[PDB]
Amino acid sequence: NQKIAEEKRKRDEINMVKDAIKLTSDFYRTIYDEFGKQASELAKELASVSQGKQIKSVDDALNAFDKFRNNLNKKYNIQDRMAISKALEAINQVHMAENFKLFSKAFGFTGKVIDRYDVAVELQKAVKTDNWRPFFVKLESLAAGRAASAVTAWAFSVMLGTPVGILGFAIIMAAVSALVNDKFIEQVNKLIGI
Numbered sequence: 001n002q003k004i005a006e007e008k009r010k011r012d013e014i015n016m017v018k019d020a021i022k023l024t025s026d027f028y029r030t031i032y033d034e035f036g037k038q039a040s041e042l043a044k045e046l047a048s049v050s051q052g053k054q055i056k057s058v059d060d061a062l063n064a065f066d067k068f069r070n071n072l073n074k075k076y077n078i079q080d081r082m083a084i085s086k087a088l089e090a091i092n093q094v095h096m097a098e099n100f101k102l103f104s105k106a107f108g109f110t111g112k113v114i115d116r117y118d119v120a121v122e123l124q125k126a127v128k129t130d131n132w133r134p135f136f137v138k139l140e141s142l143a144a145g146r147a148a149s150a151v152t153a154w155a156f157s158v159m160l161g162t163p164v165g166i167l168g169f170a171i172i173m174a175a176v177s178a179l180v181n182d183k184f185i186e187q188v189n190k191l192i193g194i
């Protein structure tokens with residue numbers, strides 16, 4: 001009955017890939033619907049950039065993100081951040097884990113994926129405070145072989161888990177860009193009036 005078992009294993013892996021593609025297409029339609037054209041286009045470009053790429057060093061991600069953190073704190077305040085923190089608190093951890101697994105698959109991540117709700121809790125902490133270092137450390141540790149695909153998969157799972165609103169979206173995308181490619185952060189800035 002190993003013959004039957006290999007067959008079911010391959011059929012399940014195939015259908016998993018199928019679900020991953022369906023989830024990503026629904027994700028881009030979602031982002032388009034609540035954030036707009038430019039936002040879904042940003043997410044698509046960044047997921048393409050991250051597939052087959054290596055995260056930047058955490059030092060560079062933070063020096064990049066600090067620039068973002070400083071323009072952002074010129075226009076938006078701590079009420080604006082607390083809003084995103086409560087949005088994150090509404091995430092369901094089960095669905096976040098499943099969607100994480102599927103996004104990872106869709107982005108070329110070949111390894112095993114575990115529930116990283118703790119990185120989401122750190123996100124809440126680092127959005128209420130301005131201490132992002134442990135957040136970017138945990139994010140890195142999430143990225144096996146330094147794969148950016150894991151990073152943006154996790155980000156997408158979090159955004160899918162909850163209405164972060166354009167500002168939360170911008171902030172998450174900006175962290176991801178800091179790890180994957182600092183280029184996307186100027187577009188991110190545009191999305192909220194720099």
